[PDB]
């Protein structure tokens, strides 16, 4: 880890936990510093208010409190913190695309984009809309990281991951490895194995920053639509679109997705020789399968073969309903795995989630 920084009291509480993995922290901090501290298309107070709205969707009083204080510090109009009905017309148009990015990103059509542009009064640029979509998705994915790892506010970095015993000098798992073995050596029931996996399945003060609370991943009126990843990948399509509209953060989103996907110590909770590229691909692909994205020649039977019953319910909670994550749930999966590796899954998860959300919104922009 980056232990001298972590144990120092001079840094953010969420940043400390992330310090366990320095290769991801490098890349995460670049985007954090670009979005919230560098000259960009939107004023510095508007960026902190977009982040409140985004984090309010999951009732995250950690991130709403940070950006509330930073909004005020950076010279934001304090009326705006009384509620969303007090912010400019430009910023309320954004809370229809925000609830979708958070909860049901597949529903983002071209009409949502059109609404945000071309009107007479204070309409959004592409330069600015792109930056706001990266802020909204960044704060949704930090919001799932905060509840997943248990990050407590400032006034014990977490109640789930104990850092002070974790810092220092000191079975069935083998089964999982064996299974990983058999996969490495190796057509119409491929699409219908994805279909089964896919359908398988308070706090008064921050309701005022959202349009429609209780909008949720779940229908409550009765499975996303199936989407071929090759139609609109990150590598080919979506990276080019962010590159042309917002040059600085296109490169830093690519390096950070690739940093969290690539990240391995080649270990499996006290075993050193494995290549676990197979396990991490499953975690990444399952979370894309929750957000409706099928990969064209990936065997989705591999998922519940490698991922426990309790890792699945944990991953799906943290990705979709991040509040109502409990410590019982965090402990109840991968019981013999090290605390740093649970954080690792939170990394893969947030980044997979973000990519899915971003890809649907960029799909809506190119179709316009």
Numbering used by the authors: 66 to 220, 225 to 239, 256 to 271, 280 to 294, 308 to 328, 333 to 478
What does the study report here?
Sestrins are a family of stress-inducible metabolic regulators that are conserved throughout the metazoan species. In addition to its antioxidant activity, Sestrins activate AMP-activated protein kinase (AMPK) and subsequently inhibit mechanistic target of rapamycin (mTOR) complex 1 (mTORC1)3. The structure of hSesn2 displays an interesting internal symmetry with two homologous subdomains (Sesn-A and Sesn-C), which have a similar structure but distinct functions. Sesn-A functions as an alkylhydroperoxide reductase, while Sesn-C performs an mTORC1-inhibiting role.
To gain insights into the biochemical and structural properties of Sestrins, we determined the crystal structure of full-length hSesn2 at 3.5-Å resolution. The electron density map of hSesn2 was calculated using the single-wavelength anomalous diffraction (SAD) method with selenomethionine (SeMet)-substituted proteins. Despite its low-resolution diffraction, we were able to obtain a high-quality electron density map by taking advantage of non-crystallographic symmetry averaging (five copies of hSesn2 per asymmetric unit (ASU)) and the high solvent content (68%). Furthermore, the helix-dominant structure and appropriately located selenium positions (total 12 sites per monomer) allowed us to precisely place the sequence in the electron density map. The crystal structure revealed that hSesn2 belongs to the family of globin-like α-helix-fold proteins, consisting of 23 helices and no β-sheets. The structure of full-length hSesn2 indicates that the protein contains three domains separated by two unstructured flexible linker regions. Although Sesn-B was originally predicted to have a coiled coil motif, it forms a helix–loop–helix structure and lies on the surface of Sesn-C. hSesn2 appears to be a monomer, both in its crystal structure as well as in its analysis using size-exclusion chromatography combined with multi-angle light scattering. Interestingly, whereas both YP_296737.1 and AhpD are characterized by a catalytic cysteine dyad (Cys86 and Cys89 in YP_296737.1), the Sesn-A domain contains only the first cysteine (Cys125 in hSesn2) with the second cysteine being substituted for a leucine (Leu128 in hSesn2). Interestingly, these two residues are located in the putative active site of Sesn-C (the helix–loop motif), indicating that Sesn-C may have acquired the mTORC1-regulating function by modifying the ancestral active site of an alkylhydroxyperoxidase during evolution.
